[PDB]
Amino acid sequence: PAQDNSRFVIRDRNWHPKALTPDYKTSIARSPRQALVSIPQSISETTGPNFSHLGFGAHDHDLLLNFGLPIGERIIVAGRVVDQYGKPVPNTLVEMWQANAGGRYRHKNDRYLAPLDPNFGGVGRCLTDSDGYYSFRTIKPGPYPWRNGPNDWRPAHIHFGISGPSIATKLITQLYFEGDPLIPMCPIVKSIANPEAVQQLIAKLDMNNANPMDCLAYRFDIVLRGQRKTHFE
């Protein structure tokens, strides 16, 4: 079974968005009013599931084939999962979901008027390799309006979920695309107080990884909490 062999650098709760960010309306009623209770790390928090033996399908990571070809900009989304110390995170679970090219999600609750794409599901999963590399093949999602202010539009984005070595590193985030004019206008994006933090969520155009005459490529590296050995404990 798992063993309590490591500690994880404490989260900077001023870097991450706070719970109460009033411009993002829903957060008002779904944010605690009491202070979080800090607790020391134990085996309970320093361990987590290892997805190495999950039976992954052949196209689990290719959104172009896992659901005709989808309509939209063909792109590769790749990068590395590293910890704050710059150490690769191997055999970790990376899951993603996104809307289609028009900003439509394949979910019962999505009633936006842009149509669904018969060849697009919008879900992927990939286990990082020995170097912490993952890659997905999909189409560039479109922006979509949502019920926040009267004229609010989310910038195009991909939802990401990363497991990491434990429950303490587990994270859910969103990737934004380089140069999108919608970014600085987003109340969710703006939940993040520091502009510099916002930059970490911006995928960069990577011509070097593109398949000439085929698809573009974006680079999105992910930094999980630093993992260290316990010492003088």
């Binding site: 991450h16 309970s44 599931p49 190495s52 999950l54 979910h107 429950i167 303490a168 985030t173 993040i192």
Partner: protein, 200 residues
């Protein structure tokens, strides 16, 4: 000071989280292997129990789009990290609340006791992570059992919560569902009886 690479900032899961992590619930076809709400197979050793609960917002309204992840030890107080659908027992699981009823459920066994870093025993508990639209960064909590009052009273973690009335918020209430042992665990994100959430 020494500054490392900053961790990638968290963002809300949003309302369509299911499509990505709760296929059935998004109401979409699932894949061969999915991570779900059944941690133990019938022949798993231990006392088989049913877990169920609801999640409330600051207005006392049900959060019907919440997503939950659970981490627990087996009946022997052991953490099984090697996730496999072949296993009699898995320590990791996922669940979500119904778009209708808005109640989540989990099928597992009562977790054995595990010690903290200092070698002190913790009362049997289940680690929970709550995600949802409106939540910028996931909320961490723990589920304890009302039938373990003795263990509960000595829990080094439970004991960190300054105010006794707040500890109550973490205790699941025993019941029976179909002649099966069940515990109810309601989460209150904000306001009166607000559930205790941790930072680690």
């Amino acid at each position: 000071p020494i500054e490392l690479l900053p961790e990638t900032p968290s963002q809300t899961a949003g309302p369509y989280v299911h499509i990505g992590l709760a296929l059935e619930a998004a109401g979409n076809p699932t894949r061969d292997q999915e991570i779900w709400n059944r941690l133990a197979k019938p022949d798993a050793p231990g006392e088989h129990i049913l877990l169920l609960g609801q999640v409330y917002d600051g207005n006392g309204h049900l959060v019907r789009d919440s997503f939950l992840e659970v981490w627990q030890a087996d009946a022997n107080g052991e953490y099984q990290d090697a996730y496999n659908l072949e296993n009699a027992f898995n320590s990791f699981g996922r669940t979500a609340t119904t778009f209708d009823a808005g109640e989540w459920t989990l099928h597992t066994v009562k977790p054995g006791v595990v010690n903290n870093a200092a070698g002190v025993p913790m009362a049997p508990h289940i680690n929970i992570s709550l995600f949802a639209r409106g939540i910028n960064i996931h909320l961490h909590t723990r589920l304890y059992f009302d039938d373990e009052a003795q263990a509960n009273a000595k829990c080094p973690v439970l004991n960190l919560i300054e105010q006794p009335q707040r500890r109550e918020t973490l205790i699941a209430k025993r019941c029976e569902v179909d002649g099966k042992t069940a515990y109810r665990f309601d989460i209150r994100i904000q306001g009166e009886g607000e559930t205790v959430f941790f930072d680690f």
